[PDB]
Amino acid sequence: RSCLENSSRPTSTIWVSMLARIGQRIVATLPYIKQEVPIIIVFRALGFVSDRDILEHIIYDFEDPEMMEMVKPSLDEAFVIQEQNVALNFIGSRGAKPGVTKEKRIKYAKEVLQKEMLPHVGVSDFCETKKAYFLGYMVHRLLLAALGRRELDDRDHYGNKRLDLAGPLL
């Protein structure tokens, strides 16, 4: 649940889930996007054509192949997306208000990919790097949870809760 700081827009949610079941195909539920999109297409849309860069942002160490076997399926799933334009078109095609043309869809995709998702890291003109690193950290945490190396996060743990006193409520 991302939220910059008492901003006009409401808090945005980013569900980076994974199919149970090829098997082990990671997806994402971006705001204002009814369907799901794989994380690899999102990374390419943020401005990362190279695969090595995407993996480095997601996975920090390459000496553990046991972790690499989990991302290979989803990585190879989206093999027909290399350039940034096609990724932007694919992400915008699933938008709530699909533009009748191609330019409108690209603009809508760039706006949702720079203002709606993860507004707390940054919503300025050039902040794609930090957004990509945060997304890679989310994927890394998801993979660690899947491997069981790190227990899940309890929902009732007050350490992950915040109280809204009269201030924020008003």
Backbone phi, psi, residue 64, to 5°: -105, 85
Q: Are 31 and 91 in contact, with CB atoms under 8 Å apart?
A: no
Tell me, residue by residue from 70 to 109, as one string, x for binding to other proteins by CB under 8 A and - for no binding.
--x--xx--x--x---------------------------
Q: Which residue in the set 55, 109, 112, 139 belongs to the binding site for other proteins (CB under 8 A)?
A: 55
Choosing from 77, 107, 120, 123, the residue that interacts with other proteins (CB under 8 A) is 120
Does 16 sit near other proteins (CB under 8 A)?
A: no
In the bound state with other proteins, the residue whose beta carbon lies nearer, of 100 and 169, is 169
Nearer to other proteins by C-beta: 1 or 34?
1
**Cβ of residue 61: shortest distance to other proteins, in angstroms?**
4
Note the Cα 126 to chain centre separation in Å. 17
Q: How far is CA 139 from CA 1, 57, 128, 133, in A?
A: 15, 9, 16, 10
> 103 or 125: whose CB is closer to other proteins?
125
Cβ density class 127-151: b for 16+ within 10 Å, e for less: eeeebbebbbebbbebbeeeeeeee
Would you count residue 34 as binding other proteins (CB under 8 A)? no
24-32, 65-73, 85-93, 107-115 -> range binding other proteins (CB under 8 A)? 65-73
Question: Which of 29, 9, 63, 42 lies closest to 113, judged by CA?
Answer: 42
130 lines the binding site for other proteins (CB under 8 A): yes
Q: What is the contact surface with other proteins in residues (CB under 8 A)?
A: 2, 5, 23, 50-53, 55-57, 60-63, 65-66, 68-69, 72, 75-76, 79, 82, 120-121, 129-130, 133-134, 137, 145, 148-152, 154, 157-158, 161-165, 167-168
